[PDB]
């Protein structure tokens, strides 16, 4: 049996709402965790864009013009794939920032709903605590009136033995006046318990719904943040496959690089002559 | 999913 | 076909075949430098990228999270520093390859300068003796022309002239003929000395060409290997990163949403029973 929020965050203290305060603090801790995940993506995207842009500049500004044939094509193949890798990491930064934007939208979505429950809970809890203070004030008054009624009845019983008719009439109207005061204090006390009980069940119902809603928010936040870590690790691991495939293109170009072919291609293109100069002989002026 | 990685040069080299 | 067989000049005073090969070595030296600059700038970029990844991992937050999701987020920061540290090590590996290429480059320049000194020596002597031999030819021809003019002058007056005036003109013709004969010997010896250096140069040119072909074969081999090694080291870095990111996925597989919620409840629960309702308390009961 999976334990729920609504069943494990109550307080035996009637005037305490610690169970709600603990859950509300957990949502604030999760909100900061969502921001920390967003902060890592933003800084990683900035680093990836800067790294990609630097690779593009190195490839475009690099030399190699003096080389010819295979070695030139191989070196140009490395510069071409370097720009492709750098441009891919620039696109990775845009992908990470899209994950950054999605989390901030989800984060602000939960805050909008959380504020609604906060207003509802703060209302019913304030009314519950207010009526509780009223009920206890009614109880203290009700109990004091009962003591006054018993004291007024004991005073009547005391003087109704050998006392005069004038002093007895005064004491009997005092006992009836105090007995009526105790009856009205009981009705006010009974009505205070009735109003307090009404709000109590309302609060218990409202607290039970808020707990299930906060559990739904936490379940969604934990799921999306777990998915964000899995997607982020996949997008970085996918970048390793894309880069490795691009660097393989350089090796494919190098397979067509023959040392003997480049030397023969340079000879056939820059050869000046296949015969050494003829020796200078003696030239007779008359022969 | 997983990168191919490095690869030995052609065995006809060197 | 080889360098020694395809870089001659039929022009005796021209050494273009040697100049073309020497220019090819200078172009190959710049190609080696351009490969060094690519490694130097790539290593600088990797060190900057690696150091930045480490700073992001160390400065990142996540303290408010607990249980699996915290361990997963801490696993991402841990592997991020490992990736950044690995890219820092990649820069040292690239710079070591950079140092090897510049060392090889200066080895060839030292040997190339030696052959340049030898060729510049024998070529200067070959051109010097050729210029001397042609100066000897011009003198020899001028002496022959002077000798023919002195003999034709004798033939002119040797018809009805006196014995004294004929002897005077014939002694001039013999004086000019002797000058042409000794000028011919100087011209002959100039051809002998020139031929000596010529054969010396042809052998020296053949040795220098064969050496330059070996240097290009070595340079093309090391640069071809340097490109293959560079591609493997970059591809190896992709494998190392994927293995590190794999550690994050393995941690995420042990990340259960329901486990984190139940673990939070068992640690922060305040009570399992709602407060008791406040009842009416009779003063007499």
Residue numbers in the entry:
A (entry chain B): 3 to 289
B (entry chain C): 793 to 806
C (entry chain A): 5 to 289
How do the authors describe this structure?
PSTPIP1 is an adaptor protein expressed in most immune cell lineages. It presents two structural domains in its sequence, an N-terminal Fer/CIP4 homology-Bin/Amphiphysin/Rvs (F-BAR) domain and a C-terminal SH3 domain, connected by a linker region. The F-BAR domain of PSTPIP1 binds to the PEST subfamily of protein tyrosine phosphatases (PTPs): PTPN12, also known as PTP-PEST, PTPN18, and the lymphoid phosphatase (LYP), encoded by the gene PTPN22. Positively charged residues on the concave surface of F-BAR domains interact with the polar heads of the phospholipids in the cellular membrane.
To visualize directly the PSTPIP1/LYP interaction we produced crystals of the F-BAR domain of PSTPIP1 in complex with a peptide of the CTH of LYP, residues 787–807. An additional continuous electron density, adjacent to PSTPIP1, was assigned to residues 793–806 of LYP. A single copy of LYP binds to the convex surface of the PSTPIP1 dimer at the rim of the dimerization interface formed by helices α4 of the two protomers. LYP buries ~ 625 Ǻ2 (2.1%) of the surface area of the PSTPIP1 dimer and establishes distinct contacts with each of the PSTPIP1 protomers; hereafter we refer to them as A and B. The LYP-binding site is characterized by three hydrophobic pockets aligned on the surface of PSTPIP1. P795 docks in a first pocket that is delimited by V243 and D246 of each protomer. D246 of protomer B also forms hydrogen bonds (H-bond) with the backbone amide groups of K796 and G797 of LYP. The side chain of the adjacent R799 makes ionic contacts with E250 and E257 of the protomer B; in addition, the main-chain amide and carbonyl of R799 make H-bonds with the side chain of N236 of protomer A. The C-terminal part of LYP (801–805) interacts with a deeper pocket formed between R228 and W232 of protomer A. P801 and P802 adopt a poly-proline II helix conformation; the ring of P801 contacts W232 in parallel. The first pocket of the LYP-binding site lies in the two-fold rotation axis that relates the two protomers of the PSTPIP1 dimer. Thus, only one molecule of LYP can bind to the PSTPIP1 dimer at any time. Finally, the conformation of the PSTPIP1 residues involved in LYP binding is very similar in the free and bound structures.
